[PDB]
């Protein structure tokens, strides 16, 4: 078809994934702005195609202010376009590095939004499998800005608490122990990634890190992190308590999104 080129005018660069070029675009008939995730289909196997339609299907199922909305999904002979609502505040990643870290108040507020979005996924039978700051976008651009959960390229359907081997996918520093152990996993993997994110928000570097990737995974599997002084000296014990529950190596013992949104540090305000 030619539905996209006819109805949209492509504009500027916004961001890139491992296989995606995302660009701003304007719906010609309305002058409304959107984000066009463009993907070369000539390069893709039948599996990657099924992943692409899977992403589209999951995005549609999810309707929430803190989840990116899908406006349209168009196929052309050599490219596929996923037209999302534009979000112009940039990646949460960009903001953390610009500010080094967030105050406990900004962190709490930010992680609350993240948790509300992933909780929505879980209650709707979705596990994202790829929570990280570069997949979290800011609405306003600067300060109090609403966070929007994006990138469902690896999301899949799970129902309840049951865990199965859904394959080896995600992002190294954010991967949970049970995935790295090649054990059956489920929704709880997203909370691990959140714990990693919260830790990043509070001091601006990840809790699991190593030059050698094999060692990094070792660290993640053993839940080997700490709170080095002086960075964590001023940080409240309750803030740390929330992280500890999220970075619980055993997923059945791991805090859920729901019972993380209750946590004092999040809710004692």
């Amino acid at each position: 078809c030619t539905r996209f080129s006819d109805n949209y005018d492509i504009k500027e660069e916004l961001g890139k994934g491992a296989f995606s070029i995302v660009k701003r675009c304007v719906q010609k008939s309305t002058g409304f702005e959107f984000a066009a995730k463009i993907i070369n289909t000539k390069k893709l196997t039948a599996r990657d195609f099924q992943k692409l339609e899977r992403e589209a299907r999951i995005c549609r199922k999810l309707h929430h202010p803190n989840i990116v909305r899908l406006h349209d999904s168009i196929q052309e002979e050599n490219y596929h376009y996923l037209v999302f609502d534009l979000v112009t505040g940039g990646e949460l990643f960009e903001d953390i590095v610009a500010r080094e870290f967030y105050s406990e108040a900004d962190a709490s507020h930010c992680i609350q939004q993240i948790l509300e979005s992933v909780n929505h996924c879980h209650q709707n039978g979705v596990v994202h499998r790829d929570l990280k700051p570069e997949n979290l976008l800011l609405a306003s651009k600067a300060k109090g800005a609403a966070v929007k959960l994006a990138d469902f390229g690896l999301a899949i359907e799970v129902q309840g608490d049951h865990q199965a081997w859904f394959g080896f996918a995600g992002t190294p520093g954010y991967l949970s122990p049970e995935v790295l152990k090649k054990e059956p996993y489920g929704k709880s993997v997203d909370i691990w990634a959140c714990g990693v994110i919260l830790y990043i928000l509070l001091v601006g570097y990840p809790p699991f890190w190593d030059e050698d990737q094999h060692r990094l995974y070792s660290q993640i599997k053993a839940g080997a992190y700490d709170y080095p002084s002086p960075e964590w000296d001023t940080v409240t014990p309750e803030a740390k308590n929330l992280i500890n529950q999220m970075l619980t190596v055993n997923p059945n013992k791991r805090i859920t999104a729901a019972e993380a949104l209750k946590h004092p540090w999040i809710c004692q305000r």
Binding site: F93, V97, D151, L154, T171, Y205, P207, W209
Partner: peptide
């Protein structure tokens, strides 16, 4: 030391039913 950096996504598959 640890530095917050962009990490690329991976999917090596291997899903078993």
């Amino acid at each position: 030391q640890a530095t917050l950096a962009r990490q690329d996504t991976i999917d090596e598959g291997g899903e078993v039913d």
